Design a protein around this ligand. Structure first.
Ligand code: PCG
Ligand code: PCG
Ligand code: MG
Ligand code: MG
Ligand code: ZN
Ligand code: ZN
Lengths: 39, 773, 773, 40
C-alpha cells in the first residue's frame, strides 16, 4: 500500500560572537638593532 | 447535607494522600477518583484515555476502561497490547482533546464526531457522553469520560460542575506524574549527551569505533530491548577503470534505492546490540539482504528519504513487510520500531539507527524520538572528529613520504663517498665493504689534506683557493684532528656520508652556502685548539660543538628571520622565536636520526642526551638577539675569571658550573658565526661584498613580493653606503665579542686585532665617500 | 472544631493546593497560618534546606507566621535570611535525623540554639519540628512554638501537625520536582549547545572556549561570569633558566598550580550580562582585575576545589570588593569558582560565576550544572590539541616538500649544459633572448633522431649516457611539434626533463633508463606505429609526458611489498599504491611554474592533460591490464571488421572511452616493451629485472621474515629462463598480438617477442638437460 | 582559614567494549599466475 506519514529532521534548531576579533633590549641599542635586522 | 460535604472532603483528602504512597502508580489514584465520580453522578463505565504524540501527530489511547464502583483495578486497567488508538480527527475523544474544552453530548447519534469502533469491538451500546481533557501548561494529558447515566437521559450542569471539581484533583495527580516523567526523560537525555561527549573526546578514532563506543555507553539510557546501526558507503565517485564498462554499455546502469545526495544505498556494516537477554553484540561486515534489520524496508526507506520513522504494531503494516513471527530462534517479536538517520555536515546520510520495541510494552512516545534524535545529532556532529582523524592520518603519511624522498635526494650516493673514501683504488676490494675499520682510517688519513698546511689551525684561513670537495676533505680532517673518531669509535664511512650530506644540505645561496658553514666550523676548531678553549670542555663536548658548528646554518634560504616573519613563511608558523635557528637544529637532528648518517652512533645514551642538548644550545646561540641578551652575563663571567692569578683555578671556576660553560659556548658560537670580520683585508672585502649582495637580493625580493621598502642595509640603491655601514657593524656587534674574548684569553687576541685592521680600511673607504659628495 | 467547619476548611486547603499558577510560598503561608489557629500557637516558621560544598544547611524562609498576618512581612528574602549548619540547632538535628522532634523546656535541650532568640529578642519555651522529606532529601523544616495557656503540647497536636504537613509536603514536592526538571533541561541544553559549538570547527583553546561559553549564556542564571586561562608552558628555555641557575635572580615564590607551573592568567574573558551585555577580552590582565582582586581564582588555580561562597565580602580570608567595582553599582554577593582540567589533570583555566539572577546563594544544583559545563570544556581540549598537531603536521609537510624541490630541481648549470645560450648568444647573464633563438640553438644541439634510431622499435639506450637520454627526450618532444604549437618555453622544457631525470632513483631496473625507454617506445608507437591517427597533438603531448614519468621515484619494491611492509605509501593509497605515488609526484612537479611545460594551455586543456596523466600512469600496473584486457580485445575485434580505414578511425575517435582503453593498453605495451627488444638488449634487461626482484626478495626475507615467491628468490636464479617463458606466454603475448592485429605497423614488435621467446625456450631446455642428469 | 570547599568529581566519569576486535575479479587459472608474477 502506502507508507505512513513520518516527521522531518528538526535541523532548523541548529541551522544558525562578539569579542572574537582579538582572540585568534637596551634603550639605545634598539635603533641599531632595527638598522641591522637583528630584531 | 453536612455529612455529604464531610464525606466528600474526606474522600478527596484520601485521594490526594494516595499520591504519597511511593512505589505505586497514578493510575490507581485516577481509578479511585473515577469510581467515586461515577458513584457521585450515578453513571457507569467511566474511562480515562491517555494522549500520545507519534510522528508529530497526536493520538489518544486506552488507559482505563469500564470503571464502576466496587471494581478491581487490575481488571479495569488496559495494557499496552489491548489499547485502542484513535487519531485526533476521529472520535469524540479526539475532538475533545483537539478543542481542549468540556464536551457534553446527551445523544451521541446527533454528532458527526461519534466513533462506534469501541461499540462494535466489545458489543456495548453508548447513548450519553461527557468528556473533558486534562490540560496543564497548554498540553493535553488525558481525556476523562462518563457514559450512559443509568437513571437519566441527560447530564445536567450540576453533574458537569462535580465533574470539573473532581478532575481538578485528577489533573493535579496527572501533573505530578507528568512532571516526574519529564524530569526522568531530561535526566536520561542529559546523561546520554554527557556520556557520548565523554566517549567521543576520549580518543580520535574512525566512524565505526567512535559510534560503537558512544552507543554502547548510552546503552543503559536508550531504554530499548534491541537496537542497531547500519552505516552506508560514502564513496561518491567511481574510478575510471570501473566506469569504462558503464560507459561502453557492457553493464546496465544501476536502478534501485539511492541516498538523496545521489549515492547507492549500500549498508556496508551493521552493529546489532541485543539487550533483551545475554547482552549480546554482533558486528556484521557486508551484511546480506536477509539480515533481520534489513528484511523490512525501513532502514532502506530511511536511507532513501532521511525521515524519522515511528511505527507501532510494525508487523501489522502492509508496506514494509515486517516479520510477523519471531525474528530468531530465540523468542523475540518486533512490536514497535523507531528509525532515524545520521546526517553529515553536508547533509549526507552516513548511517541509519534503528531502535526496536521498548522495555515496557508502551509504544514510542515523542520523548523517545526527542532522546534518539539528540543522540543521532551528536553522532552526526562527531563525524567532524572522525574526518579530522582521517585527514591527520593522510597528513602524517604525506609528511613521512616527503621526508623520506628528501632524505634520499640529500644523502650522499656511494659514488660521492667513493670520491673521498677511495676504498677500491687503494685496497683492490669490491663495492661490498668487508674491510676492517682501522684499514679505512689508515687509508683515509693519507688522502685528507695536511692540517699543518693550508693553515687549518690559523685565524687567517681563507677558503677561496679551495674547492668545495676540498672543503669536505678538510672538515673530515678537522674531525680527525680533535681525536674523537677513535675515542668514540664512530664509523669512518658514516662520518664521510654525514659530512657530504651536510654539504649537500647547504643551498646555493650567495653567502650562506656550504663555504659559510665550513668557515664557521673551522673557526670553532681554531677557537678550540689555537684559542686554548678546549681546556674548558671534554672531548665529547668538543665533538658535539664542532658538529653543531658545521650544521649551524644548514638549509639556509638566503633570507633572515625578519623575512620569515613578514612573509608568514611555514617556518615562521612552525617555530615562533629563533625561526631559522630552530629550523637548522631540527634538520640537523633529523640528519642525525638516520643510522647511516648517525655520527654519534656508538656512544652511550647519557652521552647522546648531552650531545643533543649541546647541539640545541650551540645552534640556537647563533641568533644575534640571544647574543645581545646574554653578552652582559658573558662579560660578568670574564670579569670574574680575570681576577684570578692561577690558570687552573679559573678553569675550576668555569668547569664546576655547567651554566658558565653553556654561556661561554654560546658566545664561542657567536664569535665563530661572525669570524669573517676578522679575516685579512682581501678576504674580508670579498666576503663583505658577498654578504651585501645577499642582503641586496633579499631587499629586492622583499620589495618585489612584499611591497615593502627595504632598510638601507638591505637596499641596493644605497650600495655606496656599504663602507660606512660596515664600520657600524664593527662598532656595534663584533667588537664586544672579540674584545671580551681577548680579555678572557690572550690567544684570541689576533682575531680582534684583525677586526681593528678592517675597521681602518672600511673607514678609509667611508671618508672617501664623504669626499665624493 | 465541629465537622462542618472542618470539612469547609479542608476544602479551603484543597483549593489552596491547586495553585494553577503562583508561588509555593503563598500556599505554605496559608497552611501555616491555618495551623496556628488549629494549634492555638504562634510564630510558625519554615527553614528551607540547601547543600553547598557538600555541606548541608538550613535557612529561614517564613517567619512570625501567626493567624491572619499579611505575607509580605512573613517572607524572608535572601538578604536577611539566617543560615544554620546541621550541627547547630534543633532544626539542624531534625534535618539530620529526618524525624519529628518535640521537646519541652528547650533550655534543657542539648541541641537548642538561642542565636535567633538574641537576634530577634523573642523567647521560646516549647517547640515542634518536623522536616518535610521526599526521596531521602529534606526540603523544609516546619516549626510551631510557644503553646499558649498550656505546656507539653499534645499527641493530637502532632497528629494535626502531620496531617497539615501532608498538604505542605504535596506543595513542596510539586515545586521541587518542577525545579529539578527545569535544572535538568538547562543542563541538557548546555551540553547540547556546547557540543554543537565544539563540533562546528577546529580551533584553539581561546576561540573554542569563548564560543562554548557565549552560546550557553542564557542557561547559566548568573549576572556576571568569566573564564581565566593559565599559561601552559611547563618548562623554560635554557637562556631563560641561565639567570636563575646562576643565582643572579631570586627564584619565583608565590602561587603555584598542583603541577608546579606559575599561576599566570594570560587572558580573561568577562561576560557581563546584568545590564547591557558585553564581552571583554583582556590579554595578560593586571593584578587589579575585578575577577582577580580577590584571591579566589588564584586559590582555585593553586588547589583545584569547587569554591562556593555566600556573602563573599563578609569573608576575612578573601579580599572581595565590599563596594561597587565597575562604577555601575554592581556588588559581588555570591561567588562560584571551578577549575577546567586537561586529561592529565592539569588546570587550564578557572571559570568564576558571580551572583545568581534570583539572588539566592549557589546551591548543589548550580554546582552540578557548572561542574558539568567545566567537565565538558575540559574534555573538549582534545580538539584543541588536535588542531595544534594538525597545524604542526601541515607546516612540517610543506617544509619537507619545499626542501625536496630545491633538492630535486635541476640547477642552472645543468640547464646551461644542454641549452648552451652562453657559448652561442654571448649574453651570459639573463635569459632576455627571444624564444625563437632558443628553439633554433637547441634544435642544432640536440641529436638527430634518424642517426640515433629514435624512431625504431629496435632502439637501445645502452650506447647512450643519461645526459644523452635527456637530450634525446627533448628531441622527442621537439619531433611531435608540440613545442611551437603550445608555446612551450624551451628552458622550462629542459628543466622539466632534467628534473624528471633527477626524480628517478638509482635502483637496479626502474631507473631513468626505464623511464626513457618507455617514453621512446610510446613515441615510436605514435609515429612509427601510426597510432597518432586517433589522438590530437595535445593528447600526444600529454602521453609522451606521462610516459616519461610513469615509474617516477620508484623505490625498487613491488606493490605487494608496500602492502606487506605497511609503508606510508600503502597507508596513504589503498590500491595501485606505487602508480598513485608516481601520478602524485608527477603532478607535484607540474605544479611549479618553473617546471610546468603546460604553462600556456587553457583550463580545459590542462584538465584534459591531468586526466590523461591519471589514466596513463594508473594504467601502468598489470592488475588493471589483466582486468581490462577483454574490452580492448573487443575494440580490436570490432575495428577488424570495418571495410575502410577512416571508418575505423571515426569509430575509435567518437567515443572517449575507447581512446582511453587504447591509451591504457599502449601504456601496458610500453612498460613491457623490453621483451620486444632484440636478444642482446633483452638478456641484459631481463637480468636487471631479475636482480631487482631478487633484491626485493632479500628485503622480504630479512625485514618481513617471510619466504619469498620463486620469482623473487635468489636460489631459484637458474629457474629464471623458464619463468620468463611463462612471462611471455601469460602477460606480454596478449597485448602484443592484439596490437599486431590492430595495426600491421606494430607487427615487428610482436615479431621480436616471438624471437625472444625462442631464445628463452632454449635457455630453459639446457636447464632441463642439466637437471635431468 | 579558608572555608571548606567541595572536592572535584572524577571517579564517576572516569569509567574492552565487546565487538571491537573486528571493528577497526580474475578468472580461475589467473588467480595462481597473478601470484607468481606479483601482479596482485
Ligand atoms: N464499551 C465501552 N465503550 C466506552 C466506554 N467509555 C467510552 N466508550 C465509547 O468508546 C468510544 C470511542 O470513541 P468516541 O470518542 O466516539 O466515544 C467513545 C464512547 O462512545 C467504556 O467504558 N466501555
Ligand atoms: N523570631 C522567630 N524565631 C523563631 C521562629 N520560629 C522558631 N524560632 C527560633 O529560631 C531558632 C533557631 O534555632 P533553633 O533550632 O534552636 O530554634 C529556633 C527557635 O528558637 C519564628 O517564627 N520567629
Ligand atoms: Mg644562521
Ligand atoms: Mg612502473
Ligand atoms: Zn653562520
Ligand atoms: Zn614502468
Amino acid at each position: 500500500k502506502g507508507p505512513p506519514k513520518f516527521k522531518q529532521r528538526q535541523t532548523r534548531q541548529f541551522k544558525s560572537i562578539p569579542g572574537m576579533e582579538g582572540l585568534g633590549f637596551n634603550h639605545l641599542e634598539l635603533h641599531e638593532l632595527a638598522q641591522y635586522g637583528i630584531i | 447535607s453536612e455529612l455529604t460535604q464531610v464525606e466528600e472532603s474526606a474522600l478527596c483528602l484520601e485521594l490526594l494522600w494516595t499520591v504519597q504512597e511511593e512505589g505505586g502508580t497514578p493510575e490507581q489514584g485516577v481509578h479511585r477518583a473515577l469510581q467515586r465520580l461515577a458513584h457521585l453522578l450515578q453513571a457507569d463505565r467511566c474511562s480515562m484515555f491517555l494522549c500520545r504524540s507519534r510522528n508529530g501527530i497526536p493520538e489518544v489511547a486506552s488507559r482505563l476502561l469500564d470503571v464502576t464502583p466496587t471494581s478491581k483495578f487490575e481488571d479495569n486497567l488496559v495494557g499496552p497490547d489491548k489499547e485502542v488508538v484513535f487519531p485526533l480527527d476521529i472520535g469524540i475523544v479526539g475532538w475533545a482533546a483537539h478543542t481542549k474544552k468540556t464536551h457534553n453530548v446527551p445523544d451521541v447519534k446527533k454528532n458527526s464526531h461519534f466513533s462506534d469502533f469501541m461499540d462494535k469491538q466489545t458489543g456495548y451500546v453508548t447513548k450519553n457522553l461527557l468528556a473533558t481533557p486534562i490540560v496543564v501548561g497548554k498540553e493535553v494529558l488525558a481525556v476523562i469520560m462518563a457514559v450512559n447515566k443509568v437513571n437519566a437521559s441527560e447530564f445536567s450542569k450540576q453533574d458537569e460542575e462535580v465533574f470539573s471539581k473532581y478532575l481538578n484533583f485528577v489533573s493535579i495527580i496527572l501533573r505530578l506524574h507528568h512532571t516526574s516523567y519529564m524530569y526522568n526523560i531530561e535526566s536520561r537525555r542529559s546523561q546520554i549527551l554527557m556520556w557520548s561527549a565523554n566517549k567521543v573526546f576520549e580518543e580520535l578514532t574512525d566512524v565505526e569505533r567512535q559510534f560503537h563506543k558512544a552507543l554502547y555507553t548510552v546503552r543503559s539510557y536508550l531504554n530499548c530491548e534491541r537496537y542497531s546501526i547500519g552505516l552506508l558507503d560514502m564513496t561518491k565517485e567511481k574510478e575510471f577503470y570501473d566506469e569504462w564498462p558503464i560507459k561502453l554499455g557492457e553493464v546496465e546502469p544501476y536502478k534501485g534505492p539511492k541516498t538523496p545526495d545521489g549515492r547507492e544505498v549500500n549498508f556496508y556494516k551493521i552493529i546489532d546490540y541485543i539487550l533483551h537477554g545475554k547482552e549480546e553484540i554482533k558486528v556484521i561486515p557486508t551484511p546480506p539482504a536477509d539480515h533481520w534489520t534489513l528484511i523490512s524496508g525501513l532502514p532502506t526507506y530511511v536511507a532513501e528519504n532521511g525521515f524519522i520513522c515511528n511505527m507501532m504494531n510494525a508487523p501489522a503494516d502492509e508496506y514494509f513487510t515486517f516479520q510477523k513471527g519471531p525474528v530468531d530462534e530465540t523468542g523475540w517479536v518486533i512490536k514497535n520500531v523507531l528509525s532515524l538517520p545520521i546526517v553529515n555536515k553536508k547533509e549526507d546520510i552516513v548511517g541509519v539507527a534503528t531502535f526496536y520495541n521498548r522495555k515496557d510494552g508502551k509504544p514510542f512516545d515523542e520523548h523517545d524520538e526527542y532522546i534518539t534524535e539528540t543522540l543521532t545529532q551528536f553522532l552526526g556532529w562527531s563525524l567532524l572528529n572522525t574526518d579530522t582523524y582521517d585527514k591527520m592520518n593522510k597528513l602524517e603519511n604525506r609528511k613521512d613520504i616527503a621526508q623520506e624522498m628528501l632524505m634520499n635526494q640529500t644523502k650522499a650516493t656511494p659514488e660521492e663517498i667513493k670520491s673521498i673514501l677511495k676504498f677500491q683504488e687503494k685496497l683492490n676490494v669490491d663495492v661490498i665493504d668487508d674491510c676492517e675499520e682501522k684499514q679505512l682510517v689508515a687509508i683515509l688519513k693519507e688522502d685528507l689534506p695536511d692540517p699543518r698546511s693550508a693553515e687549518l689551525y690559523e685565524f687567517r684561513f681563507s677558503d677561496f683557493p679551495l674547492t668545495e670537495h676540498g672543503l669536505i676533505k678538510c672538515g673530515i680532517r678537522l674531525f680527525f684532528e680533535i681525536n674523537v673518531v677513535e675515542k668514540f669509535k664512530v664509523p669512518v664511512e658514516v662520518l664521510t656520508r654525514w659530512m657530504y650530506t651536510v654539504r649537500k644540505g647547504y643551498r646555493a645561496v650567495t653567502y650562506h652556502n656550504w663555504r659559510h658553514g665550513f668557515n664557521v666550523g673551522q673557526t670553532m676548531f681554531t677557537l678550540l685548539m689555537t684559542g686554548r678553549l678546549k681546556k674548558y670542555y671534554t672531548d665529547l663536548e668538543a665533538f658535539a660543538m664542532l658538529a653543531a658548528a658545521f650544521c649551524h646554518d644548514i638549509d639556509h634560504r638566503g633570507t633572515n628571520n625578519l623575512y620569515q616573519m613578514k612573509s608568514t613563511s611555514p617556518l615562521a608558523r612552525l617555530h615562533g622565536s629563533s625561526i631559522l635557528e630552530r629550523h637548522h637544529l631540527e634538520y640537523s637532528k633529523t640528519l642525525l636520526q638516520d643510522e647511516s648518517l648517525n655520527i654519534f652512533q656508538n656512544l652511550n645514551k647519557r652521552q647522546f642526551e648531552t650531545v643533543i642538548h649541546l647541539f640545541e644550545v650551540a645552534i640556537i646561540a647563533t641568533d644575534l638577539a640571544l647574543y645581545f641578551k646574554k653578552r652582559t652575563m658573558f662579560q660578568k663571567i670574564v670579569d670574574a675569571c680575570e681576577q684570578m692569578q692561577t690558570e687552573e683555578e679559573a678553569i675550576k671556576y668555569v668547569t664546576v658550573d655547567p651554566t658558565k660553560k653553556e654561556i661561554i659556548m654560546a658566545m664561542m658560537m657567536t664569535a665563530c658565526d661572525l669570524s669573517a670580520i676578522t679575516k685579512p683585508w682581501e678576504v674580508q672585502s670579498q666576503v663583505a661584498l658577498m654578504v651585501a649582495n645577499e642582503f641586496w637580493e633579499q631587499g629586492d625580493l622583499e620589495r618585489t613580493v612584499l611591497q615593502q621598502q627595504p632598510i638601507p642595509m638591505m637596499d641596493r640603491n644605497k650600495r655606496d653606503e656599504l663602507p660606512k655601514l660596515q664600520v657600524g657593524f664593527i662598532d656595534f656587534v663584533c667588537t664586544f665579542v672579540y674584545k671580551e674574548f681577548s680579555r678572557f684569553h690572550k690567544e684570541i687576541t689576533p682575531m680582534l686585532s684583525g677586526l681593528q685592521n678592517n675597521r681602518v680600511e672600511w673607514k678609509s673607504l667611508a671618508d672617501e665617500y664623504d669626499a665624493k659628495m
